[PDB]
């Protein structure tokens, strides 16, 4: 059965330009007249929708900076002005025989002009202190590039376990990128110490970005 | 309006048969070209065909997994079934109902589809989440615009969905992508407004758990000495 090799697996191209992604097919694809050969866009939390049927045939609909071409094995999407809303994961599949396969999708990324993390630090929730836990949680939004390291100290000295991160997928508007570091201690450890700190390193600075608050003080 | 509505058992034990239900409205399983089927994707991960079934009563099939589907369907109420026997944890994902059109050309697309229904294969038992609220360090020297969180931890399984001020409060917003630690889901989302517009109005984190069917609201308020 027909396997689909999609490349490359990972594009960041600015704003208005060219993004151009490839589909090889394991084996022919196409007649005389038609490509069997489809495209679909999924968005980040979204069903994967319908652009291109047909390697050429726009759905009706869709913008018409969305080109499709290519035959026999090899076909081709482009994206041309990419614009912000463009950031997702496009895939494509064959109409030649059962099993109907999909290729493994190529992401689609704007690059944009560097920006620093918006740091935000959060004491545990006096409602979550009351049932034993303690969660301190770091947001480091709307940055660019998506690289980011966070660093927690307690009282000074650098705390790496009970940590847990998330990276939100390139925003739609912004095209920047935003994480969640949370801090997950025992209400009594938490007790125990006075300052606690998130430090966010960067690529947009050489000094990391810090907030700090100290337990139990205004 | 074409609608493709996708419902599952949420969560199963292994070995066990998973039956899923798509209901579909907009359009006729009488008229000819059309199908309706099944695609299903792993948790970050791409796309696998698993069946479609046709006005025909003709049903493809992907065929390493032949053995184990069944897909039917109920014309007169909208609705095809899909079932896969011995269920294991490779079947973990979100599957998707998807509209087939047969082509003029020959050929198929999938030109509509659900909205997914996420599927856990799992002994791991059922849990409902704390939803924290976080508002910001007391006494911060406040800036021109101010964050404010939700914490959402201790639950299971995927999926929690989670608003602000009931969808209404829409920009500005960052939820965070679910992480798995120890068989507990842990979520946040971020919000960020004008210091004009907190606290002077209210915002309220959203949070609802459809396998422990829980619907928490959680007002930000500024911290006290409590």
């Known amino acids: 059965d027909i396997v689909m090799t999609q490349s490359p697996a990972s594009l960041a191209v600015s704003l208005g330009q060219r993004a151009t992604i490839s589909c090889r097919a394991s084996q022919s694809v196409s007649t005389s007249s038609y490509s069997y050969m489809n495209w679909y866009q999924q968005k980040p939390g979204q069903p994967p929708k319908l652009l291109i049927k047909?390697?050429?045939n726009l759905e009706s609909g869709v913008p018409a900076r969305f080109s499709g071409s290519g035959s026999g094995t090899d076909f081709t999407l482009n994206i041309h002005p990419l614009e912000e809303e463009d950031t997702a994961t496009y895939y494509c599949q064959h109409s030649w025989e059962i099993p109907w396969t999909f290729g493994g999708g190529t992401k689609v990324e704007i690059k944009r002009a560097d920006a620093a993390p918006t740091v935000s630090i959060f004491p545990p929730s006096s409602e979550q202190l009351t049932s034993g836990g303690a969660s301190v949680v770091c947001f480091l939004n709307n940055f660019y590039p998506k690289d980011i390291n966070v660093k927690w100290k307690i009282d000074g000295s650098e705390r790496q376990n009970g940590v847990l991160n998330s990276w939100t997928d390139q925003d739609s508007k912004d095209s920047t990128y935003s994480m969640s570091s949370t801090l997950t201690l025992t209400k009594d450890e938490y007790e125990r110490h006075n300052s606690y700190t998130c430090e966010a390193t960067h690529k947009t600075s050489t000094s990391p970005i810090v907030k700090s608050f100290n337990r139990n003080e205004c | 309006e074409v609608k493709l509505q996708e419902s599952g058992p949420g969560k199963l034990q292994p070995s066990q048969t998973l039956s899923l239900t798509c209901s579909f409205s907009?359009?006729?399983?009488?008229?000819?070209?059309?199908?309706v089927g099944w695609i299903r994707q792993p948790s970050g991960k791409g796309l696998e065909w698993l069946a479609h079934i046709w006005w025909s009563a003709s049903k493809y099939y992907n065929t390493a997994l032949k053995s184990r589907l069944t897909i039917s369907k109920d014309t007169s109420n909208n609705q095809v079934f899909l079932k896969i026997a011995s269920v294991d944890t490779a079947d973990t994902a979100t599957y998707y109902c998807?509209?087939?059109?047969?082509?003029?050309?020959?050929?198929?697309?999938?030109?509509?589809w659900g909205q997914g229904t996420t599927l856990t294969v799992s002994s791991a038992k059922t849990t409902a989440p704390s939803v924290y609220p976080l508002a910001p360090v007391c006494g911060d020297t406040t800036g021109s615009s101010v964050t404010l969180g939700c914490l959402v931890k201790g639950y299971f399984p995927e999926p929690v969905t989670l608003t602000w001020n009931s969808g209404s409060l829409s920009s500005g917003v960052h939820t965070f992508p679910a992480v798995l630690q120890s068989d507990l889901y842990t979520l946040s989302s971020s919000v960020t407004v004008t210091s004009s517009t907190w606290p002077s109005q209210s915002i309220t984190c959203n949070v609802a758990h459809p396998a422990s069917s829980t619907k928490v609201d959680k007002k930000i308020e500024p911290r006290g000495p409590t």
């Open positions: 998807a509209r087939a059109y047969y082509g003029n050309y020959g050929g198929y697309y999938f030109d509509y």
């Open positions: 907009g359009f006729s399983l009488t008229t000819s070209g059309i199908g």
């Open positions: 047909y390697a050429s």
